[PDB]
């Protein structure tokens, strides 16, 4: 019935997770983005199918080039200096199917590689992971996923455990 923050709860191996889907707020972000200062990590989702063939209700605004802008803005906020990001690249089957017909050069100006799926995915990950400038404080976890992949929960669990461990070493001064 409610609109605005949406919350989901689940457990895995004696841990409790809380996920906030605040993406339906539809207002100015800058007035409420600081209410989340203290979250363990940020989960980001990017669809590999937008590399081309779909712009967004516009004329020269690529969907991937807007996802990159949002990632750049979010990763470099003043409130998110110490919070790591878990980046999910979804819908790889469509990417593999569309590489054979539509090359990757239509999205980014210079090379991709073999116009082969293995080589384009790595370049996209490298391009998307180079938008952070807080490399001394935060880290990025990337995991290609599809509509059939079923090992995402263990990736999230392990990334959260690693983030917690490194956070404590920092407090103690060790790292």
């Amino acid at each position: 019935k409610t609109t605005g923050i949406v919350e989901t709860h689940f457990t895995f191996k004696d841990l409790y997770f809380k996920m906030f889907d605040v993406g339906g707020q539809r207002s100015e972000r800058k007035k409420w983005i600081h209410c989340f200062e203290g979250v363990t990590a940020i989960i980001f989702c990017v669809a590999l199918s937008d590399y081309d063939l779909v712009l967004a209700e516009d004329e020269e605004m690529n969907r991937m080039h807007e996802s990159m802008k949002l990632f750049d803005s979010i990763c470099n906020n003043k409130w998110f200096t110490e919070t790591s990001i878990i980046l999910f690249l979804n819908k790889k089957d469509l990417f593999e199917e569309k590489i054979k017909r539509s090359p990757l050069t239509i999205c980014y100006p210079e090379y991709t590689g073999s116009n082969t799926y293995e080589e384009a995915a790595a370049y996209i990950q490298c391009q998307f992971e180079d938008l952070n400038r807080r490399k001394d404080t935060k880290e990025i976890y990337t995991h290609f996923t599809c509509a059939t992949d079923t090992k995402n929960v263990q990736f999230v669990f392990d990334a959260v455990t690693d983030v917690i461990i490194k956070n404590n070493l920092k407090e103690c001064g060790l790292y």
Binding site: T2, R26, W32
Partner: protein
């Protein structure tokens, strides 16, 4: 085509500007220059309130100037007692994203709000010995960023939908909708007679609505960034604002003009709360740099400073009788200065 309408609007705005530049015979500083100032104002903490565990976002003094109400980024809502620091009530909340709170003039109800885009009323009065949700008011699209009780049955709320509204607590459907702002409304205060109110939004402007006709009648500008706080002068003929430009300004309704600005060259952080003392001689402002300032409304010179918080100050208020000032900060503490 539409250019004719643009030209007509420009001509109307030019006429407004010309009419405004006429009553300005004089200045407010010139009239009040030949008077005796107040001097140096020194205040110290008297009571400290502990018990919260997260950032504090709202506060509202009671109508008897004894009990408080505080909202933190948890599901909790504590009714305080500044005379003897013993809590009275603690109300859990469904969504832990509270942004504002209010205390009813009858001392029987409170209110909340936040990113859930819903305002809720709690029966603090005798309800077999506990508190439960009375009504949830839905219909806003964006987050709710202020709310004030008019009576035990009517409440005015402002939201991030660039829209304010007047509700009916007995029915739950809003009876009047105030539109015209192009930005997210951030603040809202009521006049002493409860027949007019003002608002401020993320577009630099302030409007003067009336609860009966439901129409704007005056628009005040002057700031160059978002506006976060607003409150009326005790006489009801003036109000003060606070923006992200580190400046506070004073406006008067009858003259439709801007009187004074309160600023300094050592302040860059924006204001988060604005309040007048009784008789309007002292203006209180809370800033981002952990500090609270006391101004002089008539002459615009600093008269004191308050420094007891280690984090940003998000709210402040003055009792009905003007006997105390309460401050809330982004840590989990409150303080009372006198």
């Amino acid at each position: 085509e539409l250019d004719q309408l643009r030209q007509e609007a420009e001509q109307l705005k030019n006429q407004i500007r010309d009419a405004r530049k006429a009553c300005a015979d004089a200045t407010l500083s010139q009239i009040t220059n030949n008077i005796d100032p107040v001097g140096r104002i020194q205040m110290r903490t008297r009571r400290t309130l502990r018990g919260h565990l997260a950032k504090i976002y709202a506060m509202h003094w009671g109508t008897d100037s004894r009990l408080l109400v505080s909202a933190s980024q948890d599901g909790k809502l504590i009714i305080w007692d500044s005379y003897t620091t013993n809590k009275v009530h603690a109300i859990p909340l469904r969504s832990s994203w509270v942004m504002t709170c209010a205390y009813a003039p009858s001392g029987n109800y409170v209110a909340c709000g936040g990113l859930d885009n819903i305002c809720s009323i709690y029966n603090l009065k005798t309800r077999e010995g506990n508190v439960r949700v009375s009504r949830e008011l839905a219909g806003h699209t964006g987050y709710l960023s202020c709310c004030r009780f008019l009576d035990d049955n009517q409440i005015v709320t402002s939201s991030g939908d660039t829209t304010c509204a007047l509700w009916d607590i007995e029915t739950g459907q809003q009876t009047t909708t105030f539109t015209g702002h192009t930005g997210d409304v951030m603040s809202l205060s009521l006049a002493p007679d409860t027949r007019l109110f003002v608002s401020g939004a993320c577009d630099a402007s302030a409007k003067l609505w009336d609860v009966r006709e439901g129409m704007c009648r005056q628009t005040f500008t002057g700031h160059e960034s978002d506006i976060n706080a607003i409150c009326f002068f005790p006489n009801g003929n003036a109000f003060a604002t606070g923006s992200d430009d580190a400046t506070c300004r004073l406006f008067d309704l009858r003259a439709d003009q801007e009187l004074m600005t309160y600023s300094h060259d050592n302040i860059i952080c924006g204001i988060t709360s604005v309040s007048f003392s009784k008789s309007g001689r002292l203006l209180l402002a809370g800033y981002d740099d952990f500090n609270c300032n006391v101004w002089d409304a008539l002459k615009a010179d600093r008269a004191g400073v308050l420094a007891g918080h280690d984090n940003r100050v998000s709210c402040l208020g003055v009792t009905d009788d003007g006997m105390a000032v309460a401050t809330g900060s982004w840590d989990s503490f409150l303080k009372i200065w006198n």
